[PDB]
């Protein structure tokens, strides 16, 4: 257990590549924090205390059993 943890996990679906120094290279089916979401297909995530930029397209919502 580490600091951070804060945002929407979503989960990452084959497709882009985010390859760059902006955006955090992440691996397909990880979970990553949503800080926020743009209008520019680039929406800001956070993993093991990185930010970085990635397509909202190709990502899914991983809510909880709490909702409603």
């Known amino acids: 257990g580490s600091s951070g943890s804060s945002g929407e996990a979503h989960?990452?679906?084959?497709?882009?590549?985010?390859?760059?120094?902006e955006e955090l290279q992440v691996m397909p089916g990880n979970i990553v924090f949503?800080?926020?979401?743009?209008?520019?297909?680039?929406a800001t995530v956070m993993f093991n205390g990185q930010k970085g930029l990635v397509p909202c397209n190709y990502l899914e919502p991983v809510s909880g059993p709490s909702s409603g």
């Open 11 to 21: 989960r990452v679906l084959f497709g882009f590549v985010p390859e760059t120094k």
């Open 34 to 42: 949503v800080l926020k979401k743009g209008n520019d297909n680039w």
